[PDB]
Task: inverse folding
């Protein structure tokens, strides 16, 4: 129900080995760790959560772009890219969070489908 | 060897039923029709060409964004999005041309892999 | 030393009257208010800080995209757009943070000049 | 009535000295030269046309991205970036075409104002 896709706008490739941390806003308004992983050789990260676990809430998907660029050699502008959204508030949906990375820029989109 | 992926930044969905026309620059410097198709329900268009057919050259992938937006109801800025690139000049590669559409904007990227 | 520019990809216009909040990361890892404002008719927000106050550190620029879309009667995906970066003195002097907004997507870049 | 703004997503800067060629679609469906120039130090190109000359029609703005990247010693994907649009009098008066460049990608938007 939650997938992340990351592309590299410099290389024209998937962004591989990108760390991703997901948080969910708690009752007390803190950001609780929810899940985490790394993108694959295809720039994809699946298996973050289950439909049972992925309840309604406000989620933050933090993509560790700095760590990606620095592992490359390369000094980027942003600390990370954070994507924050309400999920599942009209029932369960499947979410793909995509990001396209450059050293001083990124774009992000969502694909939301109703299974 | 040539795939096209189109997303809709307004709806948060694949861009379905988008017409795509591919041209290849000829010896005489004209743009010859090469292939064409429509995106699927997943916003993807496969089956445009074969490795045999997809020789070295300068290719133009014209994504008919205006027709997409107008079929929607909706009056957009651009006539189309054109993606022009040299392909296969270091031997065969697989190319994915992606576009993310809004009424007054688009972004495009390439994913190039060596099979 | 710090400017924000916001554009609207649906209407082909500056994004006007967008709330923007800037925070600086404190020693205890919390985010403290730094500057805020609303974008102008040109989608710009100037006058956020001065050279004196804008010291090296980690800053967050939070753009209230949800309220922007809702005011236009459009349903959006994101709660906000967040741009988090380090200001570094050995780089050029002026930072412009730009964002290009759509309901389910945004783009952001930095223009850092001398 | 027509301005072009080009930014560099790798270096976080204006894209300076980029060649830009503007064409207008002729009655016979060919593209005829209209205006050209090179972006300034601020990544801008002004002075392309006048209100008198910039009549309704289909225009193409071709940004020579390949030469830009090659001059920086970087290998790029695209031959150029093409932006094709109709100018319509019943819309706002001034058109700004912006582009944000990376070696294997670009973004473009229009800001159309009165
Ligand atoms: C879900 O997204 C995908 C899934 C599979 C394959 C894909 O491309 C090969 C994509 C592309 C995503 C994408 C994201 C952003 Br942001 C921009 N700007 C662009 Br252009 C494209
Ligand atoms: C008219 O545009 C401008 C005028 C003055 C200053 C500007 O930034 C400092 C801009 C930004 C343009 C812009 C274009 C794209 Br395409 C994307 N993706 C992004 Br983000 C931003």
Result:
């Amino acid at each position: 129900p939650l997938m992340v896709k990351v592309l590299d706008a410099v290389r024209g490739s998937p962004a591989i080995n990108v760390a991703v941390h997901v948080f969910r806003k708690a009752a007390d308004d803190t950001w609780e760790p929810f899940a985490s992983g790394k993108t694959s050789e295809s720039g994809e990260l699946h298996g973050l959560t289950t439909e049972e676990e992925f309840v309604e809430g406000i989620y933050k998907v933090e993509i560790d772009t700095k760590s990606y660029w620095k592992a490359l050699g390369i000094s980027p502008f942003h600390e990370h890219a954070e994507v924050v959204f309400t999920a599942n508030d009209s029932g369960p949906r499947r979410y793909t969070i995509a990001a396209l990375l450059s050293p001083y820029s990124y774009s992000t989109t969502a694909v939301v489908t109703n299974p």
User: Anything to note?
Assistant: Residues 65-71 of chain A form the longest helix (7 residues).
